[PDB]
C-alpha cells in the first residue's frame, strides 16, 4: 500500500523528472507507453 | 491501495514531469499511449 | 508498504531525475515503458 | 557603415541570443540598459 | 565597414550565444549594458 | 573590412558561444558590458 501525508509525493513503478524549473527541447516523443 | 492526505500527490505506473515552471519545445508527440 | 511524512518523497522501482533546475535537450524519447 | 543583403543579419555593439528555440527561465532582469 | 551576403551573419564588438537550441536558466541578469 | 559570403559568420572583437545546443545555468550575469 501507499500513503502520503499532507505534502509527501510518492509513486511506484514510475518515471519522474520532478524539479522546480524543467524544460525539455527538440524532443521526438516525450511520453511513450506501449502495452 | 493508494491514499493521499490533504496535499499529497501520488501515482502508480505513471510518468510525471511535475515542476513549478515546465516548458516543452519542438516536440513531435508529447503524450502517446498505444494499447 | 510506503509512507512519507509531510514533505518526504519516496518511490519503489523508479527512475527519477529530481532536481531544482533540470533541462533535457535533443532527446529522441524521454519516457519509454514497453510491457 | 553596415549593409546586409537579402537575408544577412548583422549588428555592432550588440548582445544577441539568436537561435531557433530559445527559452529563458527564472530571470530577474532580462534586458537592462542604464545610461 | 561590414557587409553580409544573403545569409551571412556578422558583428563587431559583440557578444553572441548563437545556436539552434539555447536555454538559460536561474539567471539574475541576462543582458546588462552600463555606460 | 569584413565580408561574409552566403553562409559565413564572422566577427571582430567578439565573444561567442556558438553551438547547436547551448544551455547556461545558475548564472548571475550572462552579458555584461561596462564602458
From Swiss-Prot, chains A, B, C, D, E, F:
<feature type="modified residue" description="Phosphothreonine; by PKA; in vitro">
    <location>
        <position position="23"/>
    </location>
</feature>
<comment type="similarity">
    <text>Belongs to the TPPP family.</text>
</comment>
<feature type="binding site">
    <location>
        <position position="3"/>
    </location>
    <ligand>
        <name>Zn(2+)</name>
    </ligand>
</feature>
<comment type="function">
    <text>Regulator of microtubule dynamics that plays a key role in myelination by promoting elongation of the myelin sheath. Acts as a microtubule nucleation factor in oligodendrocytes: specifically localizes to the postsynaptic Golgi apparatus region, also named Golgi outpost, and promotes microtubule nucleation, an important step for elongation of the myelin sheath. Required for both uniform polarized growth of distal microtubules as well as directing the branching of proximal processes. Shows magnesium-dependent GTPase activity; the role of the GTPase activity is unclear.</text>
</comment>
<feature type="binding site">
    <location>
        <position position="14"/>
    </location>
    <ligand>
        <name>Zn(2+)</name>
    </ligand>
</feature>
<comment type="subunit">
    <text>Homodimer. Binds tubulin; binding is inhibited by GTP. Interacts with MAPK1. Interacts with GAPDH; the interaction is direct. Interacts with LIMK1 (via the PDZ domain); the interaction is direct. Interacts with LIMK2. Interacts with HDAC6; thereby inhibiting the tubulin deacetylase activity of HDAC6. Interacts with aggregated SNCA; may have a pro-aggregatory role in synucleinopathies. Interacts with DYNLL1. Interacts (via C-terminus) with S100A2, S100A6 and S100B; these interactions inhibit TPPP dimerization.</text>
</comment>
<feature type="binding site">
    <location>
        <position position="11"/>
    </location>
    <ligand>
        <name>Zn(2+)</name>
    </ligand>
</feature>
<protein>
    <recommendedName>
        <fullName>Tubulin polymerization-promoting protein</fullName>
    </recommendedName>
</protein>
